[PDB]
Enzyme design. Structure first.
Site, PDB file in Angstrom:
ATOM      1  N   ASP A   1      40.445   7.296  39.786  1.00  0.00           N
ATOM      2  CA  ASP A   1      39.681   7.531  41.001  1.00  0.00           C
ATOM      3  C   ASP A   1      39.305   9.004  41.125  1.00  0.00           C
ATOM      4  OD1 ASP A   1      38.572   7.257  43.644  1.00  0.00           O
ATOM      5  OD2 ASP A   1      39.913   5.547  43.949  1.00  0.00           O
TER       6      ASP A   1
ATOM      7  N   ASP B   1      41.568  -0.540  46.448  1.00  0.00           N
ATOM      8  CA  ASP B   1      40.120  -0.370  46.390  1.00  0.00           C
ATOM      9  C   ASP B   1      39.405  -1.716  46.413  1.00  0.00           C
ATOM     10  OD1 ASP B   1      40.517   2.319  46.347  1.00  0.00           O
ATOM     11  OD2 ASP B   1      39.620   2.672  44.374  1.00  0.00           O
TER      12      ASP B   1
ATOM     13  N   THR C   1      33.345   8.211  46.196  1.00  0.00           N
ATOM     14  CA  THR C   1      33.659   9.633  46.134  1.00  0.00           C
ATOM     15  C   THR C   1      33.034  10.322  44.931  1.00  0.00           C
ATOM     16  OG1 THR C   1      35.725   9.272  44.914  1.00  0.00           O
ATOM     17  CG2 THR C   1      35.825   9.170  47.319  1.00  0.00           C
ATOM     18  N   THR C   2      33.180   9.743  43.737  1.00  0.00           N
ATOM     19  CA  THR C   2      32.610  10.352  42.539  1.00  0.00           C
ATOM     20  C   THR C   2      31.088  10.385  42.613  1.00  0.00           C
ATOM     21  OG1 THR C   2      34.506   9.558  41.259  1.00  0.00           O
ATOM     22  CG2 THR C   2      32.557  10.271  40.035  1.00  0.00           C
TER      23      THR C   2
HETATM   24  N1  LIG Z   1      29.662  -3.527  35.355  1.00  0.00           N
HETATM   25  C1  LIG Z   1      28.726  -2.704  35.887  1.00  0.00           C
HETATM   26  N2  LIG Z   1      27.407  -2.950  35.727  1.00  0.00           N
HETATM   27  C2  LIG Z   1      26.467  -2.140  36.250  1.00  0.00           C
HETATM   28  N3  LIG Z   1      26.747  -1.036  36.965  1.00  0.00           N
HETATM   29  C3  LIG Z   1      28.029  -0.670  37.205  1.00  0.00           C
HETATM   30  C4  LIG Z   1      29.114  -1.504  36.665  1.00  0.00           C
HETATM   31  N4  LIG Z   1      30.268  -0.924  37.043  1.00  0.00           N
HETATM   32  C5  LIG Z   1      29.952   0.185  37.760  1.00  0.00           C
HETATM   33  N5  LIG Z   1      28.618   0.337  37.856  1.00  0.00           N
HETATM   34  C6  LIG Z   1      27.918   1.436  38.568  1.00  0.00           C
HETATM   35  O1  LIG Z   1      28.632   2.664  38.411  1.00  0.00           O
HETATM   36  C7  LIG Z   1      28.609   3.405  39.633  1.00  0.00           C
HETATM   37  C8  LIG Z   1      29.938   4.120  39.847  1.00  0.00           C
HETATM   38  O2  LIG Z   1      30.956   3.164  40.144  1.00  0.00           O
HETATM   39  P1  LIG Z   1      32.501   3.603  40.267  1.00  0.00           P
HETATM   40  O3  LIG Z   1      32.691   4.879  39.482  1.00  0.00           O
HETATM   41  O4  LIG Z   1      33.340   2.398  39.914  1.00  0.00           O
HETATM   42  O5  LIG Z   1      32.735   3.903  41.836  1.00  0.00           O
HETATM   43  P2  LIG Z   1      31.843   4.944  42.685  1.00  0.00           P
HETATM   44  O6  LIG Z   1      30.561   4.196  42.959  1.00  0.00           O
HETATM   45  O7  LIG Z   1      32.678   5.212  43.914  1.00  0.00           O
HETATM   46  O8  LIG Z   1      31.686   6.138  41.773  1.00  0.00           O
HETATM   47  C9  LIG Z   1      28.307   2.417  40.748  1.00  0.00           C
HETATM   48  O9  LIG Z   1      27.257   2.920  41.580  1.00  0.00           O
HETATM   49  C10 LIG Z   1      27.862   1.142  40.059  1.00  0.00           C
HETATM   50  O10 LIG Z   1      26.524   0.815  40.446  1.00  0.00           O
END
Ligand SMILES: Nc1ncnc2c1ncn2[C@@H]1O[C@H](COP(=O)(O)OP(=O)(O)O)[C@@H](O)[C@H]1O
Ligand SMILES: Nc1ncnc2c1ncn2[C@@H]1O[C@H](COP(=O)(O)OP(=O)(O)O)[C@@H](O)[C@H]1O
Ligand SMILES: Nc1ncnc2c1ncn2[C@@H]1O[C@H](COP(=O)(O)OP(=O)(O)O)[C@@H](O)[C@H]1O
Ligand SMILES: [Mg+2]
Ligand SMILES: [Mg+2]
Ligand SMILES: [Mg+2]
Lengths: 44, 520, 527, 529
Positions: free
Chosen positions: C55, C389, C88-89
């Site tokens: 996270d 989460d 957050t990221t």
């Molecule tokens: N399996 C997936 N397919 C397509 N997009 C994804 C997938 N997993 C995550 N994402 C994209 O990556 C971005 C970052 O997600 P994540 O790092 O898990 O949390 P956060 O959005 O808080 O950074 C998200 O905006 C999401 O749209």
């Protein structure tokens, strides 16, 4: 050693007035930044 | 931000700086305050090396004080100027300047312009100089006996507040005869002051010639008679010893014949020089260069005297007393280049051998023999003798004496008060304070003598206002008398010079309102 | 500065450059945690503790950085995390990209007020587009399953992710209601140190962290009754200072029995209640107390076969009341049998020094308990954070009556809308609109960089596919081909994205309007 | 606590010990304040009523003078603007020698006005242009204010009446005698066809009485003594010899090579014979006094004293050339007796002693001559130094008046008239330079205000009275010093004249310093070493 007062400093009048005026001018120039709607924000 | 001057600069305003200057001047004057009249006492200054300095003159005391104050150096400067000019009233000018400063301190603190004070000082000094020149009253045509009596009285008055005050009737004639035999140029370097340990103060004598200390001697100093009836002094300046001719010389001798020839020629040259020196008809040989042991033994076999390592000043004094000349070469030794005297002895005084030269009627110098203490007493006697000689020399060129004590100061104060009582405005207070400051001389004299100062000052003021002019103070009768009738005279060049020096010091001190000191 | 020489202060350009450098440094570090293809981090504390998490909120706090802008960014990230959840990221990345795009146009002879006015209109247009681009569904079980799978895909691998998704969905459906909102503080998070495989399932009941104290008590109890209470059973002294004044040993024994009769009466009352409830010997009786129990009461209750507990928390009573359905009484006044609970299978488990109690098999439970299992402590903490989460994401998706596709099609659509609305803005706000549109394309770029493909060519292909056909064409993370995000099963949230955009705009407005960093505080140093 | 970092760039690569001032608040305003504080120091010592200043340097020396040049040289200021001001003052003193505090006050007032000119909103280019226009106008109307001129330059009663105004500003009270002495010394050394030299004035400090015992001398003096026994000679002929009075030798290292008893006995005899022959040939040419500049010997001194020859030895290089130019003779690099052209044209050579200091006086009976010596008397060294500085300032003023015989009224009327003319002309100029012109016109009022403050009266009333007098129809009317009430007085009747070229050069240098200081907006310094 015979002294009247220990650790005491006395200045004149013109120098003190000039220092006070300079300090007031510096304070006014520092505070003049935050004025009007086009001013900027500060952080401490 | 960057500062203006360097880090370590000190500054002040005008009023506090002037107050500090007045305080420093008062502190400096309070040190040489008890040294004035005959009842005053001297001081004892010890430096870092452990040497004491006992002197009654204020000049030496101010020189040995070692003051690093930028404002207190004005008194030392005027003191040195007065000592180099007439050389007498060294403390009177300082006392007058201190009194003027103490009188103008309240006027400065009240809020007065310094330019007006400077103008008032200049006007008062000019008026005092004019009054002194007017009431001088000098003789027009006097005999030699009157001038001699005046010089003796001046010497006795100058030597009245020193350490030799008990023998002031003996040194007066001595200094008179010493000054009278100084031609017209008045050369102070032709007066030798010798200090021999042993004896009393009354055992001092004054010869009419020259006398110096015995220098180094060899093995031929006791085989000669140290007494001659009518000898002849020969002034030389060449070395009489077995040495090389030149330092940048080289001799390439062949065999033993030339070696023996050179060895014989060296002694032949030496003997020829000795014969040329002896054939001049002299008996006393004097030279600045040291004499070897060969000439000392050669001169002892013909009843002749010789002495080496003669100083330049002693040789010049001997030449001025006799009438010879410095002869560097021995190839021109006639009769007009040799000295002449009537008697020549060699006695022992205080365990030290000394040579005496007197009897010549054409002597233009003399030598003083001061006896008494060991070092401090001899130095004090020499200083008193020099002061008396300077006083006599000034009185000879000025020939205008005035009444001593405090009559001239009272007269000047009365004249200044009478002049201030006419002009109105702010010019009256300044002249009044200047006149009142001149009344501190009799008060200081009475304080040093331990008598009533208020009553004496009031009586003097009443006598000066009811007039009966040359009336001063008296220490013996503890009252007032006539200073002009009591044989108390002083040269007029001492009061005017001291007044001008005090006025200049006051004008230089008052016209200062800032003091900047740089680091290091 | 002249009044206090021992005080540092920055001007307009120096403070701006420092803030831009700090933002770039914070963006270049958190750029490796976007998407499931990110890299894991290993944090080592000063004591020697190892934490394996992915996270951004934990990394922003366990980085040891002393900076005002970094502290503000970490505070905003923590606020977003504990208010919404996952966001957050991406928030930090968007903030950094916006600050970079603003600084790119600031060092050219412009005023930040125009950039702020343009960013305001850009945010308004983005909100207006998001208010109509959202898709509303019925929110069935498959939608929640897909949302949980997409939220947990960027945490662990695949099997554990699916197991956690199924467990979270089952727990949510069990704690689901029709009139009351989704209430938290009901699912107990119990950690274990064994069986790190397929064992993190859901327990239909409650699992405590304390067992029985008397060794003579029964271990496995079948059908029994649950008694929830919190009355004191120890030697409670009076409020006023008192004292005994006996005469001989008989009076001492009498006074000893008198102070114990107060507890003996309650023991006899409990025994009578148990005898009235049971009667025969085919049932049991479980007593759950919140305070301690004296050994005398434990020995007296052990003769009747009672498995009572002591020293419990406050949430356990509420969980038991919500699961079994009893009454959490405080006194033994109106001790009626209707204020009891129903159980099915109660067995005590021992794990060395610790001791747990399993309360399963209930009639209609409303508070489940997730049994977390891991090999070490870092894996347990990571699984717990992932479960939290996922639960937050499921709650946010349930509370909203709409869904939003994930991937990066929404950002591309917003950028296209801002580009189409760029010449329709008067003044010098066109540069600000262009900067805001170019700053929103940081998510697809980082995704393509982390996947292992090109960036500019991929963005050009995505823009061409979006312009040639009005669809939600996302970005693939396996082959790099333009795929549909709504066809596979990638879903996000609407309120979370709205809050993220609002926080980004607020941070940009607060940073672009500050150009003075002064430190004129007290040193607090005397010596 | 949170520590703020530095700016990644010039702030990080600034290195320790160095500073940086980019804004106008930490550069232009700082320089203006420093120049104002520097000008406020020497502001009380300007006119004749200005007091002295006791400045002590690092060498433990006293400097109680009144001229601002020595004070500025004895301050050691570590400021760039103050260093530039000191350099400009030194350049003005080297060019003229009578306008330093005026330039300092003018520059300080100009910078203090430019401070508010930049504070109200005006830029630097417009201010510089307006200042240049005002300076050009003041220089154009400057020659139109000449009301006096010097008639004769060799008259004693006329030259002494011109330098008296400049001398009274330094020595208030006793100035008539000093002015008369300076005029007499300048007349006695004034040749023909102009061309006045400044290195033909000698100053001799002798401790004695006061300023009333001072006198001028038509010759030269030296603080030495007579080597021989010759006292004073009436009609003597000076024979200068640059070579030392001794036997010449070879420059290459060489020794004598004697043989047997012949050469060893004849070498000294031949040397003595040659020395005697040379001494006789030197004195046979009518010479009576021989002045050398090297080491003398004993045999040569004895041979010179045998034939009655005065020997004067000095080691000062320039003193020998001065004595040669005073008597008309030249120098000789070898022991060669003169014939009839290299003789001496003196009058009286005697050795006296005044103030316990034996000095050789070379008195000349001719009223003209070449150089002269002003024998000064005093009791303190500071007063003697002040008198010498006043004499040098008077000589410089006389040289300036000889270079340009254009006289302008002094006091405080010329500056007021120039300010009024600039204010009347600046009212017909549009644009933004009108404010700069009006400010440059107001900078000229810093001299009458300072004069009134140093006198001890008000300044606003005096300025108003002077303005009313100038507007009535008078021009040569300034302020009064002897009057205790704030009134005016005619400058032409009292005799207050000053140099026009000197004031013009001072104003030009002040404007140059102003436009040079008002052009730098950032300072880059390092660490001291
Ligand atoms: N399996 C997936 N397919 C397509 N997009 C994804 C997938 N997993 C995550 N994402 C994209 O990556 C971005 C970052 O997600 P994540 O790092 O898990 O949390 P956060 O959005 O808080 O950074 C998200 O905006 C999401 O749209
Ligand atoms: N015999 C005396 N009779 C009267 N006054 C004297 C006598 N001797 C000295 N004085 C006074 O004492 C003062 C001090 O003189 P002196 O000690 O010789 O030099 P200074 O003035 O330097 O101290 C003189 O002003 C003088 O008037
Ligand atoms: N006798 C006088 N009457 C009126 N003004 C004078 C008199 N003497 C000097 N001043 C004024 O005093 C000012 C200072 O002159 P001075 O000190 O000689 O040189 P500087 O101007 O360099 O300080 C001059 O500008 C002059 O006008
Ligand atoms: Mg005396
Ligand atoms: Mg996520
Ligand atoms: Mg001048």
């Amino acid at each position: 050693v015979l002294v009247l007062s220990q650790n005491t400093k006395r200045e004149s009048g013109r120098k003190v007035q000039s220092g006070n005026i300079n300090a007031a001018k510096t304070i006014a120039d520092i505070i003049r930044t935050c004025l009007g709607p086009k001013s900027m924000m500060k952080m401490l | 931000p960057v500062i203006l001057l360097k880090e370590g600069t000190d500054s002040s305003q005008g009023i506090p700086q002037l107050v500090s200057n007045i305080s420093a001047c008062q502190v400096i004057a309070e040190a040489v305050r008890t040294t004035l009249g005959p009842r005053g006492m001297d001081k004892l200054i010890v430096d870092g090396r452990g040497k004491a300095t006992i002197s009654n003159d204020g000049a030496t005391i101010l020189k040995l004080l070692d003051v690093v104050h930028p404002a207190a150096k004005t008194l030392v400067d005027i003191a040195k100027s007065q000592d180099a000019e007439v050389g007498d009233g060294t403390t009177s000018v300082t006392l007058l300047a201190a009194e003027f400063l103490k009188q103008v301190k309240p006027y400065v603190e009240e809020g007065l312009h310094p330019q007006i004070i400077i103008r008032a000082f200049r006007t008062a000094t000019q008026l005092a100089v004019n009054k002194i020149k007017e009431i001088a009253v000098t003789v027009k045509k006097a005999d030699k006996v009157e001038q001699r009596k005046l010089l003796e009285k001046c010497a006795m008055t100058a030597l009245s507040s020193k350490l030799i005050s008990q023998q002031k009737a003996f040194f007066a004639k001595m200094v008179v005869d010493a000054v009278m035999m100084l031609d017209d140029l008045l050369q102070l370097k032709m007066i030798g002051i010798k200090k021999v340990q042993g004896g009393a103060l009354e055992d001092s004598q004054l010869v009419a010639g020259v006398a110096f200390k015995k220098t180094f001697s060899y093995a031929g100093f006791e085989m000669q008679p140290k007494k001659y009836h009518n000898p002849k002094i020969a002034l030389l300046n060449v070395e009489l010893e077995l040495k090389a001719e030149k330092d940048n010389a080289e001799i390439r001798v062949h065999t033993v014949e030339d070696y023996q020839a050179i060895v014989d020629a060296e002694w032949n040259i030496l003997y020829d020089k000795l014969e040329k020196i002896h054939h001049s008809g002299a008996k006393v040989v004097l030279s600045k260069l040291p004499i070897g042991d060969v000439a000392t033994q050669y001169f002892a076999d013909r009843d002749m005297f010789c002495a080496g390592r003669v100083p330049e000043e002693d040789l010049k004094r001997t030449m001025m007393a006799c009438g010879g000349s410095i002869q560097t070469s021995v190839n021109a030794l006639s009769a007009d280049v040799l000295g002449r005297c009537q008697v020549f002895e060699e006695t022992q005084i205080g365990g030290e051998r000394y040579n005496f030269f007197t009897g010549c009627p054409k002597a233009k110098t003399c030598t003083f023999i001061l006896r008494g203490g060991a070092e401090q007493f001899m130095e004090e006697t020499e200083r008193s003798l020099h002061d008396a000689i300077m006083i006599v020399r000034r009185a000879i060129k000025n020939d205008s004496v005035v009444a001593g004590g405090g009559a001239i100061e009272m007269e000047l104060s009365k004249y200044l008060r009478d002049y201030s009582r006419t002009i109105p405005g702010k010019q009256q207070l300044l002249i009044g304070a200047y006149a009142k400051a001149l009344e501190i001389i009799p008060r200081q004299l009475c304080d040093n003598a331990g008598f009533d100062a208020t009553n004496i000052l009031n009586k003097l003021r009443a006598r000066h206002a009811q007039g009966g002019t040359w009336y001063g103070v008296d220490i013996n009768n503890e009252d007032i008398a006539d200073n002009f009738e009591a044989f108390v005279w002083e040269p007029a060049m001492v009061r005017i010079n001291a007044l001008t020096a005090a006025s200049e010091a006051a004008c230089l001190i008052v016209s200062v309102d800032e003091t900047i000191k740089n680091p290091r | 500065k002249t009044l206090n020489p021992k005080a540092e202060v920055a001007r307009a350009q120096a403070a701006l450059a420092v803030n831009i450098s700090a933002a770039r440094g914070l963006q270049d570090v958190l750029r490796t945690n976007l998407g499931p293809k990110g890299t894991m981090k290993m944090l080592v504390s000063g004591a020697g503790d190892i934490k394996l998490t992915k996270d951004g909120n934990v990394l922003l706090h366990e980085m040891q950085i002393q900076h005002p802008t970094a502290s503000l960014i970490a505070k905003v990230a923590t606020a977003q995390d504990d208010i919404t959840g996952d966001g957050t990221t991406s928030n930090v990345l968007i903030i950094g990209e916006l600050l970079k795009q603003a600084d790119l146009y600031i060092s050219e002879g412009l005023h930040p007020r125009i950039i702020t006015e343009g960013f305001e209109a850009a945010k308004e247009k983005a909100l207006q587009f998001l208010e109509e681009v959202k898709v509303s569904r019925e929110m069935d079980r498959e939608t929640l399953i897909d949302v949980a799978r997409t939220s947990l895909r960027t945490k662990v691998h695949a099997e554990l992710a699916d197991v956690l998704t199924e467990a979270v969905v089952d727990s949510i459906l069990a704690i689901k209601k029709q009139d009351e909102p989704i209430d938290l503080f009901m699912i107990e998070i119990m950690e274990m140190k064994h069986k790190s495989e397929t064992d993190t399932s859901l327990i239909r009941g409650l699992v405590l962290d304390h067992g029985a104290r008397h060794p003579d008590m029964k271990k496995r109890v079948e059908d029994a009754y649950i008694l929830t209470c919190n009355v004191s059973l120890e030697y409670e002294k009076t409020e006023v200072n008192s004292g005994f004044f006996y005469k001989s040993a008989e009076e001492r024994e009498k006074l000893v029995k008198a102070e114990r009769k107060f507890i003996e009466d309650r023991v006899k009352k409990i025994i009578e209640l148990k005898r009235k409830v049971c009667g025969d010997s085919d049932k049991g009786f479980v007593v759950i107390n919140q305070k301690g129990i004296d050994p005398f009461s434990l020995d007296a209750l052990s003769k009747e076969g009672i498995v009572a507990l002591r020293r419990a928390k406050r949430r356990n009573m509420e969980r038991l009341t919500l699961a079994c359905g009893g009454v959490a009484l405080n006194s033994f006044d109106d001790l009626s049998p209707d204020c009891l609970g129903h159980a099915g299978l109660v067995y005590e488990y021992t794990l060395g020094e610790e001791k747990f109690t399993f309360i399963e098999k209930c009639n209609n439970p409303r508070s489940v308990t997730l049994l977390i299992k891991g090999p070490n402590k870092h894996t347990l903490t990571q699984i717990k954070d992932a479960v939290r989460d996922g639960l937050r994401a499921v709650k946010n998706a349930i509370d909203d009556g709409c869904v939003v596709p994930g991937a990066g099609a929404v950002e591309v659509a917003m950028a296209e809308a801002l580009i189409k609305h760029k010449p329709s803005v008067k003044g010098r706000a066109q540069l600000g609109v262009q900067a805001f549109a170019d700053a929103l394309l940081i998510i697809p770029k980082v995704l393509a960089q982390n996947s292992g493909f090109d960036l500019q060519e991929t963005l050009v292909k995505i823009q061409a596919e979006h312009s040639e056909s009005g669809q939600l064409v996302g970005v693939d993370l396996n082959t790099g081909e333009p795929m549909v995000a709504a066809e596979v099963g990638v879903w996000d949230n609407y309120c979370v994205k709205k809050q993220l955009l609002h926080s980004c705009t607020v941070i940009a407005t607060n940073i672009l309007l500050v150009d003075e960093i002064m430190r004129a505080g007290m040193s607090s140093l005397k010596g | 606590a949170l520590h703020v970092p530095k700016a990644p760039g010039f702030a990080q690569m600034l290195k320790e010990g160095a500073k940086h001032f980019s804004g106008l608040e930490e550069a232009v305003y700082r320089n203006i304040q420093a120049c104002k504080e520097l000008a406020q120091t020497t502001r009380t010592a300007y006119g004749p009523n200005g007091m002295n200043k006791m400045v002590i340097n690092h060498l433990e020396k006293l400097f109680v003078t009144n001229d601002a040049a020595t004070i500025l040289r004895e301050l050691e200021v570590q400021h760039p603007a103050a260093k530039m001001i000191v350099m400009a003052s030194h350049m003005q003193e080297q060019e003229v020698g009578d306008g330093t505090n005026f330039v300092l006050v003018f520059a300080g007032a100009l910078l203090e006005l430019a401070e508010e000119l930049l504070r109200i909103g005006l830029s630097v280019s417009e201010v510089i242009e307006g200042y240049e226009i005002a300076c050009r106008k003041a220089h154009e109307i400057l020659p139109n204010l000449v009301c006096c001129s010097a008639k004769n330059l060799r008259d004693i009663d006329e030259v002494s009446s011109l330098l008296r105004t400049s001398i009274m500003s330094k020595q208030y009270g006793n100035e008539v005698f000093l002015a008369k002495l300076i005029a007499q010394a300048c007349v006695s050394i004034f040749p023909d066809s102009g061309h006045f030299n400044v290195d033909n004035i000698r100053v001799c400090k002798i401790l004695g009485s006061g300023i009333s015992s001072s006198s001028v001398l038509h010759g030269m003096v030296f603080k030495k003594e007579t080597e021989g026994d010759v006292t004073s000679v009436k009609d003597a002929k000076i024979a200068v010899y640059s070579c030392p009075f001794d036997g010449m030798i070879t420059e290459t290292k060489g020794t004598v090579l004697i043989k047997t008893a012949e050469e060893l006995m004849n070498f000294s005899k031949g040397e003595e014979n040659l020395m005697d022959a040379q001494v006789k040939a030197i004195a046979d040419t009518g010479a009576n006094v021989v002045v050398t500049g090297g080491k003398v010997a004993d045999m040569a001194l004895h041979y010179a004293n045998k034939y009655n020859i005065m020997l004067v030895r000095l080691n000062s290089k320039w003193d020998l050339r001065r004595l040669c130019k005073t008597v008309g003779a030249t120098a000789l690099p070898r022991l060669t007796p003169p014939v009839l052209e290299e003789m001496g044209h003196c009058d009286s050579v005697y050795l006296s002693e005044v103030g316990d200091t034996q000095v050789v006086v070379f008195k000349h009976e001719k009223e003209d001559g070449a150089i002269s010596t002003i024998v000064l008397r005093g009791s303190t060294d500071n007063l003697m130094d002040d008198i010498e500085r006043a004499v040098d300032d008077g000589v410089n003023t006389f040289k300036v008046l000889t270079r340009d015989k254009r006289l302008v009224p002094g006091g405080g009327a010329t500056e007021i008239e120039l300010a009024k003319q600039i204010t009347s002309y600046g009212e017909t100029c549009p644009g933004l330079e009108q404010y700069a012109i009006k400010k440059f016109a107001e900078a000229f009022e810093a001299i009458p205000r300072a004069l009134a403050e140093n006198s001890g009266v008000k300044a606003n009333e005096v300025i108003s009275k002077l303005y009313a007098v100038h507007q009535e129809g008078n021009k040569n009317v300034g302020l009064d010093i002897e009057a205790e009430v704030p009134a005016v007085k005619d400058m032409l009747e009292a005799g207050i004249l000053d140099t026009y070229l000197g004031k013009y050069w001072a104003i030009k240098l002040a404007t140059n310093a102003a436009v040079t200081v008002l052009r730098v907006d950032q300072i880059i310094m390092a660490k001291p070493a």
